[PDB]
Ligand binder design. Structure first.
Ligand SMILES: Cc1cc2nc3c(=O)[nH]c(=O)nc-3n(C[C@H](O)[C@H](O)[C@H](O)COP(=O)(O)OP(=O)(O)OC[C@H]3O[C@@H](n4cnc5c(N)ncnc54)[C@H](O)[C@@H]3O)c2cc1C
Ligand SMILES: Cc1cc2nc3c(=O)[nH]c(=O)nc-3n(C[C@H](O)[C@H](O)[C@H](O)COP(=O)(O)OP(=O)(O)OC[C@H]3O[C@@H](n4cnc5c(N)ncnc54)[C@H](O)[C@@H]3O)c2cc1C
Lengths: 529, 543
């Protein structure tokens, strides 16, 4: 008689799951395992959630529920409550002696509230509150400690800091559950506690869907996708170094990316980090990818450090997502919220096809290539529009499949509020024609995602306002009618904003310490230039 | 002076210079000095073979380089010996010169630096064998190359690596190369007083010569635009710090050489190519200054398509050097197309002497080609991307002349012109028929390329001066001018500045076609000197 609980919030996986393991630690003393998930209305980024990420979270629970079953032939499952947690955990500690509560660390400041709650309840009830660090690569408190009590605000720094520290920890053992106990619960208690019998739908949490590809959630599609990119990169690794001739940014590639699986924990990063690191494990690959050296996997590792970069940066700053109250975001003076502009930016009716391609794929699918996160974000902010970033942030945070709080704001702040990196204000990295013309030359993407534009020939599709009236007749696209005339004059805004940025840039000659590109080179790579 | 009679029999060591023109990381020198206690004096000798120090096929520019390069060491010596010791320059025959001098004084050792290039095995052995005869030690030390090429070749199982990739793999088993040797002690060394009659009979120079003494003439097919270089290990050493500094900046600076790390052709005289070519500068020293500067730091940036960390972006360039020399040691047909097991045999079209004689002159009508052949003639040195366009102009990239032609023109007028290095590059660039990318106009055409390397006509006007007046629009592709613009800018195609010699469009298609036409036959490529991959190609031009 006893029971330990693995309580998922982001772990969402069975491997390199250290708290999944601490909870099996006492299998021998007949100690039962309770797989718990709780929809407390905020957890797992379900406070501000669109329909697509919400489908994904249930896939991933669908997965772990299955997994748990078919390893103990229908014995234990995953229990999903819709509830308050500090309150659910109490009742269930009244129904069965509750030994340890096991959790993966959720460093983002916001979970510091919720988590506190039970941290306490355990104190209050004398329950071992188990917290294993495994969502991040390191223990962000060492990074912040090592760098002298404050998280590095620059990529160069962070790197230099985790190079003082060791390499990262390694994926903890595969979890053993074939031989393990399972809490059976008085069915009144289940009904009474709101425990689902049938895993819910978006519809149940009042989330509805208003799509040319899409994403399967969970640890499983996750490990699949890891081996598919692991191969293709061995294939490169092997074939001398090279990656063609096609390690330049293709936007119309598969549902390839593991970004939202990392965001929900479906895939350990320490797995990802090390399955790469191994694969290369020395061998001296003289050759780069995105301007980044590529020997030692240094090119695809780095990406996982970027994720670590922001997460870590955000640990003690709960204003991380806002502008004021936030000491590491420059106070740039964005203009007045223009709900008719904004509504244009969200709907993808701006008249700039690529942005409209990119904004519409976002809604329909919930995921967008790194280069496209750029163009749409710098378009909204400092690429003029010149509208503040907290607006592309609350939008992205809703309709993205990954949309990690720290990460999302991080990239947003970095990209739009670094007034000192002058390369960023160059329309050579801003303008979404001379770049759509590049990223998707035949208008194949644009036409996938902005269909009012099927019939426009490849001469016009990047810039259809060039079309003659007769041509607009002949191709079904009448600007102002079918496709919205440009919502702004870039020439005029581009300059408008530069001058505006210059202004501010000097009105303080010594920048304050903010979150920033580390140098122009790091801008080139962070943009694919 | 007195009983100098004793010292004659008492002994002497020769340190015989040919390449390795330097007093540092010159172990063959330290070798001679190894008997300072025995009372053995040093004899620093250089000799005008007829060949040796690449003098067989020389022009004014390199010849002069080789001399101030010698004036250097000569002073270098007196400098450290209050005029006591001096360098001795005989124009004569090695084996014979040495034999004589031996009677003048006992020789315990004759010390030289190695010379793997097969051309010298004849000259060298001559002495290897003379020492055997007079019971003199023939001392021979490897420097000039990074490694011992025989050990390089030994590892690749007896054949020399034919591909850059294959090369580093090989030298990666064999560890890092030897470190530079200690600085030399000449301050407290003895020297030799020769009988002045003997000095005369052996043609030993009193005053260091002019190129003209060797019937070498500072015309250079009629030329002198300029901004030139000087030889000497001092000069070399000067230039290594000068570049070194910069690198450290890029090193300290968050990696990257900033956006002017793309090739600038109107940069200065900076290149140490001609100094490592004459040993004026130790390659071992170049590599470990770089490798030291970068020791332990991870900086992820490329340059280059080559990583930057651990100096491996600059370190590699001396490995490129290593790659050709070492690949030539045992193949004395290296400079030739036939009898060369490693140069694919390729049906180059008959010599068109009018074509050649215009390629060498810079009268093609395609400026940057003209710009560069004329830089060659004028100055003696050419940027890499430049050597390329002109080599691919002559051979495969329009014109279809054998690479053997370009080679011997290049060996007449290059300040470096290593032998192995030159021919290798020439074959490697012109004869690699299975790398299709080299065929594409996108590295072939000199017009699209002049537009990228020399944007505003700067260079092309510096060197193709008949075109100072064409604007910038028409400067690059000046055949576009109306009859009156030509009247106007005082350059009328034909008169004034050559009408093109070939039809690139027509010729490039032709050439590619034949390269396919060759590629099919012979389905499976015969092992040859070729790039590792298409990515190597990319880094080897700048692209
Ligand atoms: C305005 C803006 C908002 C963004 N919001 C998010 C977000 O909410 N969540 C998110 O994870 N990424 C976000 N990104 C960053 C990035 O575009 C994605 O991580 C990337 O598209 C994921 O696909 P990938 O797996 O092919 O990339 P890869 O290049 O394959 O790298 C693998 C993983 O590295 C990590 N990574 C790569 N780039 C970054 C980066 N710049 N910052 C942090 N981690 C990185 C991600 O986990 C990524 O999945 C945003 C970028 C911008 C400019
Ligand atoms: C047709 C042709 C002929 C050439 N002939 C010669 C020659 O006779 N001698 C010569 O030294 N270089 C030769 N090169 C190679 C190269 O162009 C020069 O080494 C380079 O221009 C030297 O300038 P650098 O010192 O700035 O280059 P760096 O990039 O500073 O490298 C330093 C040194 O590395 C060596 N190195 C660099 N590239 C190469 C290369 N491709 N092959 C071999 N060694 C290399 C040279 O010693 C060079 O000085 C030739 C190139 C071509 C295309």
């Amino acid at each position: 008689r006893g029971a330990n609980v693995i309580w998922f919030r982001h772990g969402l996986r069975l491997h390199d799951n250290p708290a999944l393991l601490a909870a099996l630690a006492d299998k021998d003393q007949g100690i039962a395992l309770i797989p718990v998930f709780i929809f407390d209305g905020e957890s797992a980024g379900t406070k501000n959630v669109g329909y697509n990420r919400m489908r994904f979270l249930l896939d991933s629970l669908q997965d772990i529920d299955d997994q748990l079953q078919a390893a103990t032939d229908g014995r234990g499952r995953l229990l999903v409550f819709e509830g308050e947690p500090a309150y659910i955990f109490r009742r269930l500690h009244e129904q069965v002696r509750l030994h340890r509560i096991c959790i993966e660390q959720d460093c983002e400041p916001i979970w510091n509230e919720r988590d506190e709650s039970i941290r306490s309840l355990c104190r209050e009830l004398n329950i071992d509150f188990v917290e294993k660090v495994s969502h991040t690569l390191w223990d962000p408190q060492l990074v912040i400690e090592t760098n002298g009590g404050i998280p590095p605000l620059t990529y160069q720094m962070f790197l230099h800091t985790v190079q003082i520290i060791g390499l990262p920890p390694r994926p903890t053992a595969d979890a053993r559950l074939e031989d393990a106990t399972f809490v059976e619960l008085d069915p009144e208690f289940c009904r009474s506690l709101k425990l689902f019998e049938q895993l819910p739908t978006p519809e149940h949490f009042n989330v509805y869907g208003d799509a040319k590809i899409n994403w399967r959630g969970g640890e499983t599609q996750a490990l699949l996708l890891l081996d598919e990119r692991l191969k293709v990169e061995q294939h490169a690794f092997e074939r001398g170094f090279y990656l063609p001739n096609q390690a330049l940014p293709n936007i119309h590639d598969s549902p390839k990316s593991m970004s939202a699986h990392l965001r929900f924990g479906c895939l350990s990063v320490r797995r990802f980090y090390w399955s790469v690191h191994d694969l290369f494990k020395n061998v001296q690959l003289r050759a780069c990818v995105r301007g980044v050296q590529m020997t030692g996997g240094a090119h695809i590792t780095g990406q996982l450090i970027w994720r670590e970069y922001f997460y870590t940066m955000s640990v003690n700053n709960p204003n991380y997502d806002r502008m004021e109250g936030n000491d590491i975001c420059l106070s740039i003076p964005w203009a007045k919220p223009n709900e008719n502009l904004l509504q244009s930016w969200r709907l993808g009716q701006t008249g700039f096809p690529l942005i409209d391609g990119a904004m519409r794929q976002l809604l329909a699918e919930g995921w967008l290539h790194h280069t496209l996160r750029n163009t749409v974000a710098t378009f909204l902010t400092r690429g003029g529009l010149w509208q503040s970033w907290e607006h592309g942030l609350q939008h992205f945070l809703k309709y993205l499949l990954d949309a990690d709080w720290s990460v999302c704001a991080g990239n947003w702040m970095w990209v739009s509020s670094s007034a000192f990196e002058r390369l960023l204000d160059s329309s050579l990295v801003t303008c979404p024609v001379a770049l759509a013309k590049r990223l998707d030359p035949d208008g194949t993407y644009i036409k996938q995602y902005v269909p009012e534009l099927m019939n426009v020939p490849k001469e016009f599709v990047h810039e259809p306002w060039r079309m003659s009236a007769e041509q607009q007749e002949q191709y079904e696209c009448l600007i102002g009618v079918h496709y919205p005339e440009r919502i702004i004059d870039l020439s005029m805004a581009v300059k408008r904003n530069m001058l505006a940025m210059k202004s501010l840039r000097n009105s303080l000659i010594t920048p304050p310490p903010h979150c920033r590109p580390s140098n122009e080179e790091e801008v080139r790579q962070f943009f694919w230039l």
